[PDB]
Design a protein around this nucleic acid. Structure first.
Ligand SMILES: [Mg+2]
Ligand SMILES: [Mg+2]
Ligand SMILES: [Mg+2]
Ligand SMILES: [Mg+2]
Ligand SMILES: [Mg+2]
Ligand SMILES: [Mg+2]
Ligand SMILES: [Mg+2]
Ligand SMILES: [Mg+2]
Ligand SMILES: [Mg+2]
Ligand SMILES: [Mg+2]
Ligand SMILES: [Mg+2]
Ligand SMILES: [Mg+2]
Ligand SMILES: [Mg+2]
Ligand SMILES: [Mg+2]
Ligand SMILES: [Mg+2]
Ligand SMILES: [Mg+2]
Ligand SMILES: [Mg+2]
Ligand SMILES: [Mg+2]
Ligand SMILES: [Mg+2]
Ligand SMILES: [Mg+2]
Ligand SMILES: [Mg+2]
Ligand SMILES: [Mg+2]
Ligand SMILES: [Mg+2]
Ligand SMILES: [Mg+2]
Ligand SMILES: [Mg+2]
Ligand SMILES: [Mg+2]
Ligand SMILES: [Mg+2]
Ligand SMILES: [Mg+2]
Ligand SMILES: [Mg+2]
Ligand SMILES: [Mg+2]
Ligand SMILES: [Mg+2]
Ligand SMILES: [Mg+2]
Ligand SMILES: [Mg+2]
Ligand SMILES: [Mg+2]
Ligand SMILES: [Mg+2]
Ligand SMILES: [Mg+2]
Ligand SMILES: [Mg+2]
Ligand SMILES: [Mg+2]
Ligand SMILES: [Mg+2]
Ligand SMILES: [Mg+2]
Ligand SMILES: [Zn+2]
Lengths: 86, 135, 59, 134, 52, 158, 50, 122
RNA sequence: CGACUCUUAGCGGUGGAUCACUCGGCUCGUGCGUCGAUGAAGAACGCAGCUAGCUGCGAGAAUUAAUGUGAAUUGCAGGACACAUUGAUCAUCGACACUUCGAACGCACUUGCGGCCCCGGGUUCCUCCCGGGGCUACGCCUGUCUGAGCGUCGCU
RNA sequence: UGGAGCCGCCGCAGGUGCAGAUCUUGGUGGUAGUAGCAAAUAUUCAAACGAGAACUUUGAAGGCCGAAGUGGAGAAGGGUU
RNA sequence: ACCCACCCGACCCGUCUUGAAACACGGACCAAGGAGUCUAACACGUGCGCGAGUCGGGGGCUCGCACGAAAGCCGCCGUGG
RNA sequence: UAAGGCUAAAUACCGGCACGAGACCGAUAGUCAACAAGUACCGUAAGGGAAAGUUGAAAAGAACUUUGAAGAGAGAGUUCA
RNA sequence: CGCGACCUCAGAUCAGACGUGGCGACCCGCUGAAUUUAAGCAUAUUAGUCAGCGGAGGAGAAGAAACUAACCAGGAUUCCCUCAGUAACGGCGAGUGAACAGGGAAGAGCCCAGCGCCGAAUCCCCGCCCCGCGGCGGGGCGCGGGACAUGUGGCGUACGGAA
C-alpha cells in the first residue's frame, strides 16, 4: 500500500504560485514561499546553492531600469537637454 | 553574558565547544545599545553613546544621533562629514567609539593582530601565498 | 464584441453607446479561455442589430 | 602592423563584428570600386553601392563587359542583384543571382544631393593627404 | 592552474654571455649562411653602413 | 613516512591555501601604472621637485644600523626654530616637518639646520602674482630655471 | 477544475496560446535553424506548472 | 497621408485631440476589417495608424510637460516628475554649494599659509 | 554447385568516429566603477498584417520624439514615400512614455472591500447611481497645529 | 575516396600513446522474428463509405452491465481534453 | 600480404596469489574519452655562469608594448638572503 | 598622553559596464550552456538539469513525363559534384 | 477655578525632508562547525576557516602615537621585499607562528569638549524683491516665526595656547 495505491489519493495541493518570485512554491498553510520567503521583506538566498543563486541574479531578467542606467551613465547622466537641433 | 543558543545543550561536537553557560559576547553592551538605536532610526546616523546607570537586570545608555539631511548639519562644515554615505551605519560596522573597542586595534606591541586594517585583514595578509612571477 | 479585460459592464455599455450612437438594453460579459473578455450586448428594441451590424462593417 | 591598442585583429572578433553588422554599417562594407574613368574624374577610389547604379560584374561566371543596372541591395545577404545577372530555375522562373558588391565595378553612379556631398568629402580628404605627403 | 611557474629568470652575466656569443657569430659567414640567410653577394659580413 | 636522512621538515600547507594564492601577473601592468601616475604628478607640480619635500638627515636605531644614516620623516621644530623658518610656512616651501621628533644630541641638530639653510640658498621661490613683491626671486633665476629636480632633493650620502 | 480563480485561468490561457505550431513562413526566413516548435505540450503527457 | 511630428508641434491643443480621435476611429475600422478579411491593403494601415496615433499622443505629452516645467522653473518646491532624476545616491550628494563651505579657521589658513610655487638648485 | 556456416575482398546499408572548419568558451590584463519610494532587482500578463520560441518593447507595447546617417526593410504581402525631401533604414538616445505584482504603500490577496477631496454623464449639490481624476504604508528628524498630566511654579 | 590545408629537420612545451577500472558517453549484435500481445461469458449476417474493412458507420440478430450500473449528475485534479 | 590444405606445436586474457586454463573475480562487441599532475620545501646527482663571493628580488630608470605585459640598464649591485 | 572626532595616496577586486591579449580548449573538449539553455524534462518543495554546431560558391532545394491510395520509386533536370 | 509660564508626554492623510529592498568579486562588524591531521583519541589541528546574520564603498577598513626602542636613537596609516618558518606556542607531538629594526611604493595632515574671553557676536524655517536656476544658491529687505544660556558661533587643542 505504501506505494502505487497510495499515489492514488494525491487529490490536493501544498504549494501554489508565489506572487513575488513566481515559483509554484507558495505553501498555502504556512502562507510563505520557500524560494523567496515571500511574506518575508527580504529575498531568500543562501550561499550553499551557488547554482540557485545564479538562476535569478540580476542579469537574468529584463533589467529594464538597470539597462538604461548603464547607458545613461556611459554618456554622463545628462538630464533635461537635447542635441543641437536642425 | 551570552548563553549559546542551542536546543537543550546539544552543542554536538568536540568537547572543546561543549560550553553554553559561562561564555561572553565580543562586542560590549554599550555597542549593542548603539546598534539598536541605529537599527530603529535608520535615517539617523549614530555618532556616540554614554552611560546613565545600571540595575542588576539592565543597563542604560544614551545614544547621540544626527540627521544627515537637516540643513543646519548639512551646511555646518564641521559636521558635514557625517552626511557622507561612507558613514552610513557606523555602529553596525564597528566604528563608533564603543564598537571600536572590540576590534582590538591600537598602536604598539599589545596588538599585532589588527596590524593591517583589522583583525581579519592581518590574517588575510599572513595567509596569502604570495606567488611571485620569477620565484 | 471582444472587450478589454479590465472593463465593467457599465463601461462597455457606456462605450457601446458612445461609439455607435446607439443604446443598450443589457451587457452580458464572460471571459474566453484565450484571455479576451467577450461581451454579448443586447440592444434596446427601438434598434435593430442587423442594421447597426451593417453600419459597423460586419455581416 | 596595427598599433592602436583598441582595435582587434582577432578572427572571432572581426568575423562576429562583420556578420552581426547593422544596416548602416553594412552600407560601408558593401562598397565597390569606380571605373578607372570615374576614378580619374571624381578623385575617389570607391563608393557605397546603391539601388540603381550602373555596374559591371568583374569576376565569376557572370564576369562580362555588359553594363547592367543594379536591381536591389540585400544588405542582410551581403549582396546586390543586377539587371540581367540571373538564372532560370527548374520551372522557368528567372531568379536574380547575387553578386557581392566588391566583385563589381560602378561605371555610372546614381547622383543625388547626398551622394554628391559624399564624393566632395572623399575627394577633399584625398587631396589633403597628397598635400601633406608633398 | 594559473600559478604554474610560467616565468623563468636567468643570471645576468649568462644573459650577456649569450648576447656576446650571438654577436660573435653574426660575423662568420658560415654561421650566417648556415642559418639560411642568403648572404652570398654581400660586400663585408660585419656589414656596417653610413649614418644617413 | 621518512626514508633515510633529510630535514624533518614542516610545510605550512594544511589550511585551504589555494583559496588565498596571490599571483603576480599584475606586476608589469602595475609597475607602469605607478610610473605613469608618477610622471603625471611631476607634470602637475610644475617646477617643484618630483621627489616631494626636502627631508631631514637621521641616524637609524639599534647597534646594527647605528652607523648608517637615512632620510627621516621630517625636520624637527627646534631645527626649524634655529634655521628661522616658521613651521606653518615650511610646509608651503617643500620642507618636511614632523613635530614628534625629539632632538637629543646637538651634532644631529646643527647638521639638520645646515640642511635647511642650504635648501633655502638653492631654492627658487616664485612670486604669487607675475607682478613681483618681496621674497620672490629675480626673473633671471626663474627664466634660467623653471626646472624640476630629478631624484631625491639634496640626497643624503653616508 | 470548473472552480478556477482568475489568476489560474489567465495562466492557463497563455499556456493554451503557447502550444500552437510554428508558422511555415518562418522556415523560409534567411538565417533559419528552426524546423519545429519543440515546446509543444500535450495535456495527456506532461502536466503544467501546477 | 503621412503624419509627421514636424507640423504637430505648432498646432493648437483642441486641434491635436480631434486628430487623435480621427486616427482612433480609423484604427477601429481596420481592426474590424482584419476580422472580416478586409484586404492586405487595409491591413497595412493598421500599423501606420498605430504609429501616427503614437506620434500625436507623444507631441501632446511633450507640450503638456514643457509648459509644466516652464510654470515651475523658479519655484522651490516642484513636482517629483519635474525634479531631476539622476540616481538615488546622486540626489543625496552634498549641494554643490554646501561641499565647498570652508570653516573660517580653514579659510584663515589658506590666507596666511598658501602653498607656493617653488623650484630648487639655483 | 545445392541450403546453412566460416573467411577474405567489391559494392550497398547501419552508425556518426576521424579530419577540416568555429559569431562559443577558458585564462591573464587594462580602464571605469553606475541600482532603489522620482518605485530597484525579480516575477506576471500583454503587444507583430501573417509570429509559436528566443530576443525587443508596455495599452504611444517588434516601439514615439529627437540627433547622426542617407536608400532601404525584405520569408510573403502590402505599402509608403517624390530618397533635389527632417528623409527610407540602421545607429545613438538628451525629450516623451513606461500594464500588473514586487522593499511594495488605503486594507486585503478573493483580484475582494473600502474611506476622504474635485471633475463629466447623473443631478440641476438630491443624495443616490455610473465613469474619470487626486489623496489615504510603517518608521524617523526639523518645524507646525490640537491637546494631556494630585509634574514644577506664577498671577488671580 | 575526399575537397583545403599540411609536413621534414634543429630547439622548447605538454591536459602526449589503452584491452581491462561490475570504468564514462554514444553506437551495434547474439539471444529472436523468441518470450510474449490469456483477468472480468459474445459474437454473427447484410449493406454504406471507401484504394483498401475481422475492428468504422447503419440496419437486423444474439449477448452482457442489471439501478450498491458498464446508466444519469457533481466535488477535488486535469486544462481545452 | 587473401583464401584453402596438411604434419607438429598450442587451454583465455587481465589480475590478487606460495599456486590460475581454473568449479577464483572483471570482460557480449565497436568508437571516442580515461589515471603519477602542478605548487611549495628539502636532499643528492648532473649542466652552465661567476667565484670569497654570489644573487636578484622587490623597487626604479628606458615606450604608445605591434611583437613587450618581453628586452635592456641601475653608487639601488646590495637593504637583504 | 588613553577613556571624543575627520583625513586623500600607494592597496584589494572569480560581481557589473566597456575593451585588449593568449605556446589554453576546438562540439564526449572548452562554461551547465558554440544551437529558441538554466531551455526542455523531473521533483509537492528546497532543488536537480540535459541532449543538440557543419547541403552548396549560389537554393541553382529536383520543372516536366510515368508507376502507385500514398510513402516510395524509374527517367528528366540543377551542380565541378 | 480660571488664565498664564515651563517640564514631560500624546495625536494629526499637519509643512518639508530622510530610512525600508537589491547586488555582493573585493571591504567592515558579529557568529562559527565538522569532515580532516595526529597513522587510535579527548587538548591540539582543521580554523576565527565553510555555512549563518548584520552594514558599506568605489574602494572599504586603518591612520596622525597613552608608538618603537634602549641607539650616536627612530617618528601616523596602508602596501611590497626582508626580518623568518625566526622569537614564541604546542598531549614541547602532530603541528602552529608574529613583531622591531633595514630597504622600498606613497606620503598630508587636522578638528572639538574642556579652560577662557567676546551684548548669542550663532543656526533653522517663513514672506517680499534683483540675479542664478536639470547638483536650490547668492545679495538685499521685513518688530515675520522658532532653536539656543541645561551653551550656538569667532579665537584656540598639547607641535603648546591666550592675553
Ligand atoms: Mg579539538
Ligand atoms: Mg578598555
Ligand atoms: Mg618617494
Ligand atoms: Mg495523467
Ligand atoms: Mg573652531
Ligand atoms: Mg562483405
Ligand atoms: Mg554527436
Ligand atoms: Mg570548402
Ligand atoms: Mg594543452
Ligand atoms: Mg577501448
Ligand atoms: Mg509466439
Ligand atoms: Mg455525461
Ligand atoms: Mg590482498
Ligand atoms: Mg590463497
Ligand atoms: Mg591468469
Ligand atoms: Mg577446479
Ligand atoms: Mg575480489
Ligand atoms: Mg562477467
Ligand atoms: Mg583513446
Ligand atoms: Mg647541485
Ligand atoms: Mg576613521
Ligand atoms: Mg554537439
Ligand atoms: Mg558533437
Ligand atoms: Mg560541451
Ligand atoms: Mg565531430
Ligand atoms: Mg555531420
Ligand atoms: Mg561532423
Ligand atoms: Mg565531392
Ligand atoms: Mg541595503
Ligand atoms: Mg585521526
Ligand atoms: Mg588513518
Ligand atoms: Mg577514529
Ligand atoms: Mg586556531
Ligand atoms: Mg562566509
Ligand atoms: Mg575610509
Ligand atoms: Mg589617537
Ligand atoms: Mg612602524
Ligand atoms: Mg633564512
Ligand atoms: Mg592558528
Ligand atoms: Mg566653547
Ligand atoms: Zn516566492
Amino acid at each position: 500500500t505504501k506505494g502505487t495505491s497510495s499515489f492514488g489519493k494525491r487529490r490536493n495541493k501544498t504549494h501554489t504560485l508565489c506572487r513575488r518570485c513566481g515559483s509554484k512554491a507558495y505553501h498555502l498553510q504556512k502562507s510563505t514561499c520557500g524560494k523567496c520567503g515571500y511574506p518575508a521583506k527580504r529575498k531568500r538566498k543562501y550561499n550553499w546553492s551557488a547554482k540557485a543563486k545564479r538562476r535569478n541574479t540580476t542579469g537574468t531578467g529584463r533589467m529594464r531600469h538597470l539597462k538604461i542606467v548603464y547607458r545613461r551613465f556611459r554618456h554622463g547622466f545628462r538630464e533635461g537637454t537635447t542635441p543641437k537641433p536642425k | 553574558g551570552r548563553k549559546r543558543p542551542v536546543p537543550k545543550g546539544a552543542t554536538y561536537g568536540k568537547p572543546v565547544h561543549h560550553g553554553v553557560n559561562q561564555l561572553k559576547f565580543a562586542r560590549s553592551l554599550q555597542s549593542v545599545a548603539e546598534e539598536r538605536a541605529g537599527r530603529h532610526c535608520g535615517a539617523l546616523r549614530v555618532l556616540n553613546s554614554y552611560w546613565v546607570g545600571e540595575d542588576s537586570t539592565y543597563k542604560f545608555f544614551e545614544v547621540i544621533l544626527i540627521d544627515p539631511f537637516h540643513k543646519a548639519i548639512r551646511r555646518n562644515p564641521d559636521t558635514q562629514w557625517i552626511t557622507k554615505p561612507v558613514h552610513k551605519h557606523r555602529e553596525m560596522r564597528g566604528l563608533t567609539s564603543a564598537g571600536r573597542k572590540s576590534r582590538g586595534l591600537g598602536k604598539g606591541h599589545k596588538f599585532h593582530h589588527t596590524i593591517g586594517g583589522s583583525r581579519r585583514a592581518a590574517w588575510r595578509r599572513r595567509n596569502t601565498l604570495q606567488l611571485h612571477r620569477y620565484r | 464584441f471582444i472587450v478589454d479585460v479590465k472593463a465593467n459592464k457599465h463601461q462597455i455599455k457606456q462605450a457601446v453607446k458612445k461609439l455607435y450612437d446607439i443604446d443598450v438594453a443589457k451587457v452580458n460579459t464572460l471571459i474566453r479561455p484565450d484571455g479576451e473578455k467577450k461581451a454579448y450586448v443586447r440592444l434596446a428594441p427601438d434598434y435593430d442589430a442587423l442594421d447597426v451590424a451593417n453600419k459597423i462593417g460586419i455581416i | 602592423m596595427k598599433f592602436n591598442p583598441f582595435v582587434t585583429s582577432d578572427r572571432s572578433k572581426n568575423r562576429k563584428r562583420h556578420f552581426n553588422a547593422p544596416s548602416h554599417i553594412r552600407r560601408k562594407i558593401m562598397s565597390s570600386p569606380l571605373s578607372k574613368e570615374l576614378r580619374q574624374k571624381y578623385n575617389v577610389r570607391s563608393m557605397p553601392i546603391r539601388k540603381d547604379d550602373e555596374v559591371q560584374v568583374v569576376r565569376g561566371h557572370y564576369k562580362g563587359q555588359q553594363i547592367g543596372k543594379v536591381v536591389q541591395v540585400y544588405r542582410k545577404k551581403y549582396v546586390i542583384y543586377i539587371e540581367r545577372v540571373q538564372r532560370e530555375k527548374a520551372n522557368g522562373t528567372t531568379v536574380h543571382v547575387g553578386i557581392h558588391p566588391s566583385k563589381v565595378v560602378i561605371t555610372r553612379l546614381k547622383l543625388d544631393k547626398d551622394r554628391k556631398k559624399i564624393l566632395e568629402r572623399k575627394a577633399k580628404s584625398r587631396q589633403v593627404g597628397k598635400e601633406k605627403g608633398k | 592552474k594559473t600559478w604554474r611557474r610560467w616565468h623563468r629568470r636567468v643570471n645576468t652575466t649568462q644573459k650577456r654571455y649569450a648576447i656576446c656569443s650571438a654577436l660573435a657569430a653574426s660575423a662568420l659567414p658560415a654561421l650566417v649562411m648556415s642559418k639560411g640567410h642568403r648572404i652570398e653577394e654581400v660586400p663585408e659580413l660585419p656589414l656596417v653602413v653610413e649614418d644617413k | 613516512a621518512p626514508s633515510r636522512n633529510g630535514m624533518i621538515l614542516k610545510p605550512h600547507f594544511h589550511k585551504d591555501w589555494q583559496r588565498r594564492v596571490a599571483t603576480w601577473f599584475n606586476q608589469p601592468a602595475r609597475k607602469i601604472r605607478r610610473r605613469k601616475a608618477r610622471q603625471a604628478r611631476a607634470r602637475r607640480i610644475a617646477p617643484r621637485p618630483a621627489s616631494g619635500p626636502l627631508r631631514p638627515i637621521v641616524r637609524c636605531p639599534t647597534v646594527r644600523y647605528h652607523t648608517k644614516v637615512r632620510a627621516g620623516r621630517g625636520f624637527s621644530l627646534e631645527e626649524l626654530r634655529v634655521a628661522g623658518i616658521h613651521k606653518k610656512v615650511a610646509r608651503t616651501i617643500g620642507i618636511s616637518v614632523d613635530p614628534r621628533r625629539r632632538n637629543k644630541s646637538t651634532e644631529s641638530l646643527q647638521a639638520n639646520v645646515q640642511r635647511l639653510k642650504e635648501y633655502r640658498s638653492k631654492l627658487v621661490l616664485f612670486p604669487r602674482k607675475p607682478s613681483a613683491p618681496k621674497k620672490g626671486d629675480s626673473s633671471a633665476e626663474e627664466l634660467k630655471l623653471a626646472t624640476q629636480l630629478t631624484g631625491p632633493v639634496m640626497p643624503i650620502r653616508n | 477544475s470548473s472552480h478556477k480563480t482568475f489568476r489560474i485561468k489567465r495562466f492557463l490561457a497563455k499556456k493554451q496560446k503557447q502550444n500552437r505550431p510554428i508558422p511555415q513562413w518562418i522556415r523560409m526566413k534567411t538565417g533559419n535553424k528552426i524546423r519545429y516548435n519543440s515546446k509543444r505540450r500535450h495535456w495527456r503527457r506532461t502536466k503544467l506548472g501546477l | 497621408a503621412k503624419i509627421k511630428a514636424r507640423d504637430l508641434r505648432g498646432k493648437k491643443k483642441e486641434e491635436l485631440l480631434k486628430q487623435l480621435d480621427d486616427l482612433k476611429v480609423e484604427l477601429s475600422q481596420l481592426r474590424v476589417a482584419k476580422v472580416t478579411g478586409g484586404a492586405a491593403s487595409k491591413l497595412s494601415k493598421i500599423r501606420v495608424v498605430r504609429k501616427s496615433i503614437a506620434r500625436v499622443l507623444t507631441v501632446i505629452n511633450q507640450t503638456q510637460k514643457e509648459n509644466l516645467r516652464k510654470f515651475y522653473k523658479g519655484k522651490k518646491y516642484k513636482p517629483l516628475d519635474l525634479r531631476p532624476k539622476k540616481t538615488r545616491a546622486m540626489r543625496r550628494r552634498l549641494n554643490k554649494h554646501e561641499e565647498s563651505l570652508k570653516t573660517k579657521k580653514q579659510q584663515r589658513k589658506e590666507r596666511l599659509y598658501p602653498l607656493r610655487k617653488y623650484a630648487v638648485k639655483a
